[PDB]
């Protein structure tokens, strides 16, 4: 059934406070969807740059959805409350979600869907490879790019005017 979706806007996800979010609220906004972790070598560069992008582009319509996951080196061990508190240290004002799995049979259906999209395909299969993979989503909820763990968020900035 998640296979039949054609837009991110068809999904819902539980935010970091335990409340459901209809992802259709991102309709008309360019969105970055990313899997985060607090204990990765690139935690700092990723959070800092995402906060910076959000601050500078939120008025142009940039939204950021951050999904914690503990699937990559067990680098997100904390509770949702502890992760929320960690994000607060970076002055995060974008949208934090409850911890999920992004690979395997229990992965969040959004993540299952993103990974098989025409412009969401991975390199070396479609599995998320490590923390801080980023998906760029257009104003219609279509996946338009996948950026790998090594591609810092500021790499995405040049692509934003292609979809604003």
């Amino acid at each position: 059934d998640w296979r039949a979706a054609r837009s991110m806007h068809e999904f819902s996800a539980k935010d970091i406070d335990g409340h459901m979010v209809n992802l259709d609220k991102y309709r008309g906004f360019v969105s970055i969807v990313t899997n985060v972790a607090s204990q990765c070598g690139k935690t700092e560069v990723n959070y800092t740059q995402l906060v910076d992008l959000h601050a500078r582009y939120a008025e142009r319509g940039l939204r950021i959805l951050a999904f914690p996951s503990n699937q990559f080196g067990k680098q997100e061990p904390g509770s949702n409350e502890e992760i929320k508190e960690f994000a607060a240290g970076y002055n995060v004002k974008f949208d934090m979600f409850s911890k999920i799995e992004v690979n395997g049979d229990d992965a969040h259906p959004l993540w299952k869907w993103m990974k098989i999209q025409p412009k969401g395909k991975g390199i070396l299969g479609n599995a998320i490879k490590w923390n801080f993979t980023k998906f760029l989503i257009d104003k219609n909820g279509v996946v338009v790019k996948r950026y790998g763990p090594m591609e810092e968020p500021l790499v995405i900035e040049k692509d934003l005017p292609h979809y604003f």
Binding site: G41, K42, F72, G73, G122, I123, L124, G125, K129, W130, T133, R146, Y147, G148, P149, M150, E151
Partner: peptide
């Protein structure tokens, strides 16, 4: 430069 995630990941793909 050596891959900074070794040995947990070897920078293969995305």
């Amino acid at each position: 430069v050596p891959c900074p995630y070794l040995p947990l990941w070897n920078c293969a793909g995305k």
